[PDB]
């Protein structure tokens, strides 16, 4: 009070010092029942993957495919989530969803990359410049390898141009080097460019396939598809808290509501367009929002020159939670005696500390409101 | 070129370890990295990986709860955090580097290796 009326002696009355706020401690988050579960496994747990000849620019649409089993696959060695860092890929995708596999031969894994033309991409697959999307070549041995060596995937060893970016490259005609005609009967200059990947257990784990898949993300102004999922926690109630329901964040206090929401509403709002109540993803259940408590505190004394003791008023607050209100416990110890104590008083004003209740009647003093007054008696009295 | 090693199986009780690698050859921030280890029965099996920015990282199956990796952009330099040793993980590490990033067959720079004994 002497701060803030910046003297050393004040007057008998009720001085207002300070604001006071509960801080939140959560901070819980909630989202819908994901359970929409892509079917990508199969195009992780098939035994014959897409042909770098046919790989089809394959769309798979509208359901969560969840990478974090991919980071914890225990099978990849070169996957890399261009664009975006993989450990956020889950968290947020980005729209043009479009889905790419093949099982590749290891043995030029670094050449697939932007800005890196080479022989695979060349003929078979390239990546362009500011790749967004992931690219990921990993161990696929012991299935795509059969005896004698797997010659489920061929190749296109041979084009006429170097391959556009993201063109899956498909042909039955020969490559074209020379003048002199191959007459259909193959020739000299005929060179069929659909070679076979040799994939035996003979070869080591680079001339082994490494399985690419490519998880392209492009940019048009077309709605996204497919997203990896979203964690939840569960959810507290009667305590401040922060919390983010599936899109929209606020802090406050969650409580069981009593009203009534039609099958197709979320939230609710009231008169001045204030959210009031929200239905959680997971339960369908509606629930009551309510500000965290705040208020000011006002100090009342009977003047330095007469005593020096004083009483704390904290307004329109529920005479429990001032000790938590105010941090007490990070105040001096001599503050932490008007926080909690004997004379502990709920009026229709607030919650008072340091006063004493009294049955009789007197004049009016000190004002506190709605009736009540305080003064001094040799004491504080209320 | 000068890709170097550092560390040694010294426990003389239970404890862990740190390999400090350097790529002081060529550029450290255009090549993604991994690390690789030797056991006496095995071959150069991977362990880690770490991108050309440090950040893109995800650690092989046998060391992805306990082994962790770091690299800086600068400062040409690089750690692994050996923590909890295992006898397993008695090995020949190399530390090295690659246009891609993990369990490449070829790399372009292989380290002088590090024989760090987890004994007993």
């Known amino acids: 009070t002497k701060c803030t009326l910046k003297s050393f002696t004040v007057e008998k009355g009720i001085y207002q010092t300070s604001n006071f706020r509960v801080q939140p401690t959560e901070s819980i988050v909630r989202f819908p029942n994901i359970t929409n579960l892509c079917p990508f496994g199969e195009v992780f747990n098939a035994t014959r993957f897409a042909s770098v000849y046919a790989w089809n620019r394959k769309r798979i649409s509208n359901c969560v495919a969840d990478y974090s089993v991919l980071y914890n696959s225990a099978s990849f060695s070169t996957f890399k989530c261009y664009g975006v860092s993989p450990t956020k890929l889950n968290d947020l995708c980005f729209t043009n969803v479009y889905a790419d596999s093949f099982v590749i031969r290891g043995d030029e894994v670094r050449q697939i990359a932007p800005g890196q033309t080479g022989k695979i991409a060349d003929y078979n697959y390239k990546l362009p410049d500011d790749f967004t999307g992931c690219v990921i070549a990993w161990n696929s041995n012991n299935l795509d390898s059969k005896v004698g060596g797997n010659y489920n995937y061929l190749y296109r060893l041979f084009r006429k141009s170097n391959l556009k970016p993201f063109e899956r490259d498909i042909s039955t005609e020969i490559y074209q080097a020379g003048s002199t005609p191959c007459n259909g009967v193959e020739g000299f200059n005929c060179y069929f460019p659909l070679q076979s990947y040799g994939f035996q257990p003979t070869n080591g784990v680079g001339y082994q396939p490494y399985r690419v898949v490519v998880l392209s993300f492009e940019l048009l102004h077309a709605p996204a598809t497919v997203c990896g999922p979203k964690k939840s926690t569960n959810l507290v109630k009667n305590k401040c808290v922060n919390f983010n329901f599936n899109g929209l964040t606020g802090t406050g206090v969650l409580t069981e509501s009593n009203k009534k929401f039609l099958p197709f509403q979320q939230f609710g709002r009231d008169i001045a367009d204030t959210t009031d109540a929200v239905r959680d993803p997971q339960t369908l259940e509606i629930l009551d929002i309510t500000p965290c408590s705040f208020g000011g505190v006002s100090v009342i004394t009977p003047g330095t020159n007469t005593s020096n003791q004083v009483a704390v008023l904290y307004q329109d607050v529920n005479c429990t939670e001032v000790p938590v209100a105010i941090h007490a416990d990070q105040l001096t110890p001599t503050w932490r005696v008007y926080s909690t104590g004997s004379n502990v008083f709920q009026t229709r004003a607030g919650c008072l500390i340091g006063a004493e209740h009294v049955n009789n009647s007197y004049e009016c003093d000190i004002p506190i409101g709605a009736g009540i007054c305080a003064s001094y008696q040799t004491s504080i009295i209320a | 070129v000068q890709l170097v090693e550092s560390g040694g199986g010294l426990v003389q009780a239970g404890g862990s370890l740190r390999l400090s690698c350097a790529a002081s050859?060529?550029?450290?921030?255009?090549?993604?990295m991994g690390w690789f280890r030797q056991a006496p029965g095995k071959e150069r099996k991977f362990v880690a990986t770490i991108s050309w920015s440090g950040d893109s990282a995800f650690y092989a199956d046998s060391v992805k709860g306990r082994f962790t990796i770091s690299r800086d952009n600068a400062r040409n330099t690089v750690y692994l955090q050996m923590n909890s040793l295992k006898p397993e993980d008695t090995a020949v590490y190399y530390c090295?580097?690659?246009?891609?990033?993990?369990?490449?067959?070829?790399?372009?720079?292989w380290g002088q290796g590090t024989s760090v004994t987890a004994s007993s």
């Open positions: 050859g060529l550029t450290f921030s255009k090549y993604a």
């Open positions: 090295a580097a690659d246009r891609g990033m993990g369990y490449g067959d070829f790399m372009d720079y």
